[PDB]
Design a protein around this ligand. Structure first.
Ligand SMILES: O=C(O)c1cc(O)c(O)c(Oc2cccc([N+](=O)[O-])c2)c1
Ligand SMILES: O=C(O)c1cc(O)c(O)c(Oc2cccc([N+](=O)[O-])c2)c1
Ligand SMILES: O=C(O)c1cc(O)c(O)c(Oc2cccc([N+](=O)[O-])c2)c1
Ligand SMILES: O=C(O)c1cc(O)c(O)c(Oc2cccc([N+](=O)[O-])c2)c1
Ligand SMILES: O=C(O)c1cc(O)c(O)c(Oc2cccc([N+](=O)[O-])c2)c1
Ligand SMILES: O=C(O)c1cc(O)c(O)c(Oc2cccc([N+](=O)[O-])c2)c1
Ligand SMILES: O=C(O)c1cc(O)c(O)c(Oc2cccc([N+](=O)[O-])c2)c1
Ligand SMILES: O=C(O)c1cc(O)c(O)c(Oc2cccc([N+](=O)[O-])c2)c1
Ligand SMILES: O=C(O)c1cc(O)c(O)c(Oc2cccc([N+](=O)[O-])c2)c1
Ligand SMILES: O=C(O)c1cc(O)c(O)c(Oc2cccc([N+](=O)[O-])c2)c1
Ligand SMILES: O=C(O)c1cc(O)c(O)c(Oc2cccc([N+](=O)[O-])c2)c1
Ligand SMILES: O=C(O)c1cc(O)c(O)c(Oc2cccc([N+](=O)[O-])c2)c1
Ligand SMILES: [Cl-]
Ligand SMILES: [Cl-]
Ligand SMILES: [Cl-]
Ligand SMILES: [Cl-]
Ligand SMILES: [Cl-]
Ligand SMILES: [Cl-]
Lengths: 142, 142, 142, 142, 142, 142, 142, 142, 142, 142, 142, 142
């Protein structure tokens, strides 16, 4: 606060228009609108970005580390697979909240391990799109 | 909503007055006050209970299943150990949110498995006492 | 024989009125009636008890060990989790039959390990409420 | 009911005359007599067969699937080892009960995994020869 | 080529008339017709055999090793369980293709290990009955 | 059919000119020619693409999901490592066939696990370059 | 010192009168006498309690944490199973000694893992009833 | 002694004429001649049989158990896979020696586990055809 | 020699200016200067590149394979995670040395497995920035 | 009693003068003095030896087995690694107590397995130098 | 042949006079006599040595490698634990036979892994003292 | 610097004259010459010792700890097996570099775990004899 970095990884540009049983009927742009409006009332700025590239995501983390600005991260598949991501996050001085739209713990046994959690401030899973909004509100207090 | 069952398990009566490095400087009673005030503004009732007994906790879940009222659960150690708890929760018709005050994923490798998660709606870990408050607010929307 | 201890653990007071896809449409009291009537014709006494408390169950086992009277045990979740139970049973001089209402082997991989089996006389799973009745009838022969 | 297929696998022709510490002093033929007499009073027909051949056993299962007649199976060693058996059973429309004469759970750790259980109706272990008789009686109710 | 050995293991005589959700509505004989007709146009002979016996299958492999003729193998359950089979195949001078009608990788975790694959030329799973036909056509090129 | 998406992942631009013990003496362009000619006679269009980038591959899958057009995927190393890929594929409405040029099961034990298989229609491994051609022909039937 | 909390868990009220091959011919009350007399000569007070309830034990630990008084713990089965216990102990400011009457390491492989050890001062196993007495004497020095 | 049962399992009829890198250039019949001649000088009878059928092998073991005559067993693949075999052997009153022609411990990691060893008198691996002859000579002493 | 490819992966552009407890106070550019000066005296050319992109790194390896020029690789997180990298390296005709700035073996247990090592010439870990310089000097001899 | 063999393994000659955070400020010779004085009052003889050689230690055990005299063993690293030691101890007719100066269970996960425990009378860990003294006193009773 | 190195490891000097349930009533010297007499008739020299020291054993292997003379090895505990031994043996040009007096496979699960087997010619276990004699006789043929 | 302890473990006296495929054609003495000459130019003293005894090696480490002089360690097999070594090294105040002549990571899966690495400064594997020389040069800088 004021500035709050919201980051989505691979596939998360496909929200709503594809799925929506599993990650909900809300499109990406609509999500940016949701976050931006909730940051308004909270008196925060939400810089909300999405990418299907690990190097892009990496860069955004690098920048957040530098600017010492907090992050909210939905890294998609890279959550379970990337050590490069984890280690970039590890550097962040500001809090990092890990967010999952679906409950990870009620799926394939592999989706239950996370490289991000151990170095996150805390995690939200399965509360859907609202996970982002609840994460925001946390940061506005701390 | 209106009625929201908030449940803490073993040891969680010792909040603040003991620790507070790990689970924070906020006492139990103060937590009940926090929750009760946040439920006020939200237009919910928070029935917040704590017990060091598995049979007691079981009973409270039974009642919540019956009344079809939502639960927020910080089951302490029973999270990693009790199948009896998990299965009582499994019955709940209303949403169940699993809450951890400390980040479970940044501790002993054993604290990372949960019998509750797979059948929870979703989970919050490491956001501290606020985890309860963010959980509440979820339920008020859904 | 004559005296046969029938014991149910956690959650098993909720039979029929809750579930009944998984553990059947038969309530607890109705089960006591079923057992008591089958013991009648067999010329046995069925002392059938249920508790959601490990210390209670423990006590009933202690008493059965002392009285050297047989046990039929549906320990619910404690089957997979409690070493305290297992060891109390281990003491029983009389036969112990382990009973599961649902087939344990057709569920979560964790439900397939039992602390009770290795020291039971034998086990019945998935034959539903009748498991108790078939267990009884065994004891009446041996 | 009326027709109930009782099947024993490898080595089970050696009952009583060999062992009898572990699987009891009752010979195979005597077991057929026991089952046939219990089916009499129950008003069932017991077609009780034994083979040391997987292809033979397979064939008998095939036939039972076809005739939609229930099975009681003591598959000996093939219980822990054969996927071919499991899958033939999987096809059966009628209930299948898995029977073990000795308690499997009180022996070598390997004897504790079963390919049959997950797709059985239910299982009986360690109740000795009576396991067959209790299984029968189940089927006569359902 | 010309001569191509097509071999099915346990249960695979039950094709179509039983299942057909999982392994398809095509009967065994119809499959022989399918293969024989595809070998016609390809200018190959298809010797297509099925057995529920490991010793029979073994013998057919022995003969194929001797005649140095290629094999297409759907060994059913023996795929995951038999080292005797694997080792007989290992001897084959000609290519061996492993065929599965259902996708093995989308089922029980145990169905995912194969004793045959490591010493096969290659494998086809989940393409249904056509797996055989595509395997044939391979052999006609190499 | 008509339109069939053929996709190769990392390193697969190096075909023939490098290796060729392991993945064969056929160059990439020659492979496109092979596929394009086989699609000709089949009356299909083969859109055959290769990339060493996960985001690129992701995008091509996204497009195929959208256009509801089938995919043939040789994802190279990402087969064993990427959950992001798997999940993009999971979305595809049309069949997906997983193709490996080398037999994966006859190499390092790690090359034997696949994130793609469980959600593929079926898989071809070790039939070399022809795997693509046999996959095509499948799709032309279904 | 002066005040030394001695705590036994589940089943440990059955000492001597039941067993005594495994945990010895000495009854509970006799053990209290033994400890109380050894504390006499040492110039300590031994407050020796036993319970079959986890909540009771929990409470006694809570009190010991508060009073900053040392503990000697024979938690029976809860040693291998309870994280709730472990964490209550973790809080104790004073030394905690873990005591086992039987050698845990010469039994079932499961009895060899302890949730208590990692946060104990030290452990005594297999020295029988004397383990308590040797533990006492330690505390009297430190 | 006098009578010594020598048994080979699956594939072992193919000795010499096929392989011979791995299990040696000596044919089966030649092996029978070797054994029969060594039993001559030793003053034993060697009844040497081979089968590719588990039921056949089973039967021969049954007979040996009955006649209380010793066995030398090269069970091929069934060594690593069959519990039915192991248990038939378990019954033998006379010594059983397990024989492997190739060193099992210098091959695939799976070939290193044996169901037979734990209940054998002792084992010989990798000494080639002579393993049989050395086994014989043992029995002639004991 | 003369030409030596030095490659850094993800995050390694952040050297010195960020960290420096763990990977040292030396910036990337300063590292290029260090390497370039050491190659001077050695009579080698150091082409030192860094990228946060797997496809970029892949390309540089491809080129090195082609030019048959040696590589020194600090692949960051991709060391533990990428099979695509490993396999591109596998192709290199020239020696590859794997370099880690921090000791990998004194950190998280996951950082201890490497996809690169098995196909490297050799590895240097924990000797800090000098690892690169010692690697260079190796290549100048061989 | 009278004669009590006290044995230390590798590195344990370095006590006090090196460490002393972990195994305490007490030197070896001082430990011999401590033990010798405690054996005085107890009316025992303490023959206390230390060696960094497995063959030496072996020999001392051999002698103790022969003389049927009890042992107290701090085998250092050989505790977790040597089967030769374990088996020499296994022979001892007299009690063996296993002693660890540091709590083994609060360190590296590998330090938690012991080859000695299963065949010890009992074990003391983490009670520091006093572990030896408490062990002595045990032996003086039994 | 002529010269055959027979080597025993740790504890094996204690044969007969200690045990003899497990490794037999035959003393070491008597074993040397047995071997020396059997080598006589065979026309071999048996150089039979025993040591409780790894460096000694190492040296004897070194010498055997040098002299290219065969070895028979009973390495006691070092069989399951030493890589140093294994690797010294690995060097031997002549055959190495691994000998165990007791059946290793019928004991603790840990005694079943051997560092020696994979690089032995072959192994004998459980044939008692005669294992040595049968090993000798092998070498005299090859 | 000046004084640098170079230590080789078991079998490493056999360098060059035996092997040399795997650890190179350079004899031990020649290695001492190599190291001594490289230390000359560096202005260091190399005290280079080798032993096949764990107690000897232990002693040399003890001395190095005492003298606070750096170590370079090629511990041969003890690398994967000895906790006694690891712990002696752990004490060293000066840097310790772990050196392997062969690439450990390209061999048996067991050779890939090291007790030494976690407490080393850093490690060199597979750079052959030069590993020692590069290690030296490191120490001369730090
Ligand atoms: O936020 C999550 O809970 C989540 C977790 C995962 O493991 C994903 O791969 C993941 O990413 C996907 C994967 C496939 C499709 C979509 N999508 O169509 O929004 C998103 C999201
Ligand atoms: O909410 C959590 O994050 C939490 C997680 C756990 O695994 C606990 O055992 C746990 O319970 C404890 C354990 C020990 C002490 C206290 N306390 O003094 O508040 C609470 C809490
Ligand atoms: O008898 C069984 O097969 C059984 C097995 C289990 O693992 C249970 O947790 C178990 O207990 C439950 C759990 C949840 C709900 C009920 N119930 O509503 O009867 C019973 C029963
Ligand atoms: O019914 C059982 O409990 C049972 C379980 C098993 O794992 C058997 O192998 C098994 O089969 C055997 C094995 C060896 C001997 C006999 N028999 O002499 O009856 C039967 C039976
Ligand atoms: O070809 C396969 O994909 C396949 C794989 C398996 O694991 C089988 O057990 C298997 O065999 C069965 C098993 C049960 C029933 C039938 N069938 O009724 O055709 C076939 C087939
Ligand atoms: O299609 C396969 O069977 C395959 C499987 C893999 O695991 C690959 O990494 C893989 O990709 C590579 C890896 C290295 C080199 C090449 N190439 O020079 O064609 C291709 C291909
Ligand atoms: O102190 C021990 O060594 C001990 C260890 C355990 O794992 C117990 O379950 C345990 O508790 C029991 C269990 C069953 C019976 C009795 N008892 O009759 O004293 C005590 C005691
Ligand atoms: O005696 C052995 O060492 C042995 C061990 C095995 O694991 C076999 O499968 C085995 O059986 C085979 C397998 C394939 C071929 C032959 N054969 O051509 O003699 C024999 C033999
Ligand atoms: O060279 C290494 O020892 C090393 C090993 C790793 O596992 C890395 O992730 C790794 O990459 C990182 C990760 C996070 C931050 C930095 N950095 O600020 O230089 C570099 C480097
Ligand atoms: O008694 C123990 O608790 C103990 C346990 C261990 O695992 C040791 O390696 C061990 O040995 C060491 C190891 C390193 C240094 C010393 N020392 O300087 O006394 C002693 C001692
Ligand atoms: O030859 C064997 O079968 C054998 C196997 C082992 O694992 C031993 O530790 C072993 O060594 C011992 C161990 C303890 C005692 C004796 N002994 O009194 O002859 C010998 C021997
Ligand atoms: O430095 C190494 O890379 C190395 C690694 C190991 O695991 C050894 O056992 C090892 O020791 C041996 C083993 C067998 C033979 C020799 N040698 O003839 O030099 C040396 C050396
Ligand atoms: Cl979580
Ligand atoms: Cl069961
Ligand atoms: Cl596959
Ligand atoms: Cl312990
Ligand atoms: Cl063996
Ligand atoms: Cl390394």
């Amino acid at each position: 606060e004021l500035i709050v970095n919201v980051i989505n990884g691979p596939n998360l540009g496909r929200l709503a228009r594809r799925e929506p049983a599993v990650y909900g009927g809300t499109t990406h742009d609509e999500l940016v609108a949701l976050i931006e409006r909730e940051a308004a009332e909270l008196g925060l700025k939400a810089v909300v970005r999405q990418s299907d590239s690990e190097a892009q995501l990496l860069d955004w983390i690098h920048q957040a580390a530098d600017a010492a600005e907090p992050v909210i991260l939905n890294a998609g598949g890279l959550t379970h697979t990337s050590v490069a991501l984890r280690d970039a996050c590890a550097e962040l001085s500001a809090p990092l909240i890990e967010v999952h739209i679906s409950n990870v713990h009620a799926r394939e046994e592999f989706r239950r391990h996370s490289y991000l959690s151990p170095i996150a401030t805390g995690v939200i899973v399965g509360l859907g799109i609202q996970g982002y909004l609840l994460a925001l509100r946390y940061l506005a207090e701390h």
